[PDB]
Amino acid sequence: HMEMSWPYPLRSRFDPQVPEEDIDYSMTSPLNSDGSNFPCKGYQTNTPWRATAQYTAGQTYNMTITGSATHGGGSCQLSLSYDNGKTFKVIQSMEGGCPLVSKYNFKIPGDVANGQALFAWTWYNLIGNRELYMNCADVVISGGTGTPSSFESAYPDLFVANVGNGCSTVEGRETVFANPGDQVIYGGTVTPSSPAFPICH
Ligand SMILES: *[C@@H]1O[C@H](CO)[C@@H](O)[C@H](O)[C@H]1NC(C)=O
């Protein structure tokens, strides 16, 4: 039962600009098991475009995660989409121990693309039902040397499981991504030597 509290995601209770009627007061719910609200609970399609962060390529920022239960930790990614959620590319993986701290730093790579993006937090809980948690924020990127094409070629695809796609996490096993990218935080029982798990086809 956690949600992204900074930068403010779509329909966030924490964002003063969201009209009372549009706030998702149950944002800590996991994504639907059948994939019917993947990605971003579908909010990228039906919410006004309004940036809640301005990110400069090469600079470091923090995001925050807030809630009432950490389900023993797990693994997260932070990702960017330049096509309003058709494709997500990973800029940081937190393998193990996520979210046992409520603040993570991350560097925006130099070769990101510029303009409107979605910034997505994904979380795979360690203990309990096999869920995916996902919130997306509208953000604007500046000062990158990439294009959406060069960025999409150079970075890993978002790890997607527990949304009815034949790929599942496994209770009691740390989620260690096959493709984590070069910006990795290790926590819980995961080390740089831990094998990738699960393996999806
Ligand atoms: C870090 O997060 C806090 C919210 O906890 C926010 O006010 C601040 O602007 C963020 N700073 C950076 C550099 O991202």
Author numbering: 1 to 201
From the paper:
Here, we report structural and functional characteristics of a single-domain AA11 LPMO from Aspergillus fumigatus, AfAA11A. Using a single copper ion cofactor, bound in a highly conserved so-called histidine brace, LPMOs carry out oxidative cleavage of glycosidic bonds using molecular oxygen (O2) or hydrogen peroxide (H2O2) as a cosubstrate. For chitin-active LPMOs, only C1-oxidizing activity has been reported. The catalytic activity of AfAA11A on chitin increases when supplying reactions with hydrogen peroxide, showing that, like LPMOs from other families, AfAA11A has peroxygenase activity. These results show that, in stark contrast to the previously characterized AfAA11B from the same organism, AfAA11A likely plays a role in fungal chitin turnover.
Only one of the conditions tested resulted in a protein crystal suitable for structure analysis, for the de-N-glycosylated protein. The structure of AfAA11A was solved by X-ray crystallography, and a complete structure was obtained, which, however, lacked a bound metal ion in the histidine brace. Of note, except for one GlcNAc attached to Asn62, the structure of this N-deglycosylated protein showed no other signs of N-glycosylation or O-glycosylation. The structure of AfAA11A shows a typical LPMO fold with a core composed of β-strands that are connected by several loops and a few short helices. The core of the protein consists of two β-sheets formed by antiparallel β-strands, which are arranged in an immunoglobulin-like β-sandwich fold. AfAA11A contains a typical LPMO copper-binding site comprised of the nonmethylated N-terminal histidine and His71. The axial copper coordination positions are occupied by the hydroxyl group of Tyr133 and the methyl side chain of Ala69. Because of the Tyr25-containing insertion that is unique for AfAA11A, the substrate-binding surface of this enzyme shows features that are characteristic for chitin-active AA10 LPMOs, such as CBP21, in particular the presence of exposed Tyr25. Interestingly, both AA11 enzymes as well as CBP21 contain a small pocket close to the histidine brace, which has been previously associated with chitin-active LPMOs.
